[PDB]
Amino acid sequence: GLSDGEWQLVLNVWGKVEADVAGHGQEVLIRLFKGHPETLEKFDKFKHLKSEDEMKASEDLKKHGNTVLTALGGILKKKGHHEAELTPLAQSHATKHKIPVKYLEFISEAIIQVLQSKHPGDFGADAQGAMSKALELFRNDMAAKYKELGFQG
Ligand code: HEM
Numbered sequence: 001g002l003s004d005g006e007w008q009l010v011l012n013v014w015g016k017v018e019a020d021v022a023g024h025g026q027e028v029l030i031r032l033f034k035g036h037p038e039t040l041e042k043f044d045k046f047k048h049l050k051s052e053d054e055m056k057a058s059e060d061l062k063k064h065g066n067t068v069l070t071a072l073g074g075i076l077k078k079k080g081h082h083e084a085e086l087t088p089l090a091q092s093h094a095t096k097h098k099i100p101v102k103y104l105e106f107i108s109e110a111i112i113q114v115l116q117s118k119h120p121g122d123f124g125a126d127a128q129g130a131m132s133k134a135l136e137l138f139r140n141d142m143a144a145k146y147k148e149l150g151f152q153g
Contacts, residue, residue: 002133007079009130014076016119017069024114025065030055031110039103072111076134082141090145101143101153108135 002010017024030052033040040046043064049055071089075082093099112131115123123131143153 001137002080002130006130006133009127010076010134011079013115013119013123013127013131014073016122017115018073021069021073022062022066024118025067025069026056026062027065027114027118028069028107028110029061029065031113032107035110036103036106039106042097042099042103068107072138075138080137082138086138086141087145090142090149093142094146094149094151101139101146104139104142108139111135 033046033049033055034052040049045060045064046055046058049058049061055061071085075085075089078085112128112135115131116128147153
């Protein structure tokens with residue numbers, strides 16, 4: 001539900017993420033886990049990470065962060081017409097990983113926080129608003145797919 005101008009601002013700051021996907025992904029997950037400690041309970045692989053230093057050293061955390069942002073990038077680049085990319089994610093997140101829409105809100109927050117911390121100059125008022133909207137569109141379409149699949153939106 002974004003304008004063309006809004007999608008442009010989204011893809012322009014996403015260009016910064018594409019210059020270092022894994023570093024941004026790492027920071028996103030660390031911000032998610034430190035901010036909302038309960039999210040860490042969905043990851044049986046990361047149950048032994050007892051501090052930010054342990055999270056920073058984990059090669060599997062950094063690879064997962066890379067996987068997450070690569071996928072989200074794929075979705076953002078479709079500017080709304082992302083059904084084919086969104087479906088498999090909604091399927092796996094509603095069924096196997098058991099990820100509530102609320103945790104999608106927490107990771108959306110962490111994405112924004114990381115963009116703001118790393119690119120303060122490039123992530124101004126207009127780019128922040130546009131990115132909020134894009135993440136909201138993503139959460140809303142994930143939620144609608146979850147409901148169609150028989151789960152809580
Ligand atoms: C921007 C939002 C997110 C995106 C784009 C995303 C993307 C992905 C992708 C691409 C995978 C691997 C393929 C698959 O299984 O579907 C994955 C796996 C996973 N995701 Fe998500 N994810 C997101 C948010 C979350 C959140 C918020 C959580 C938990 C709080 C989560 C938990 C997991 C888990 C537990 C796995 C499997 C990990 C493993 O192999 O041990 N994801 N995610």
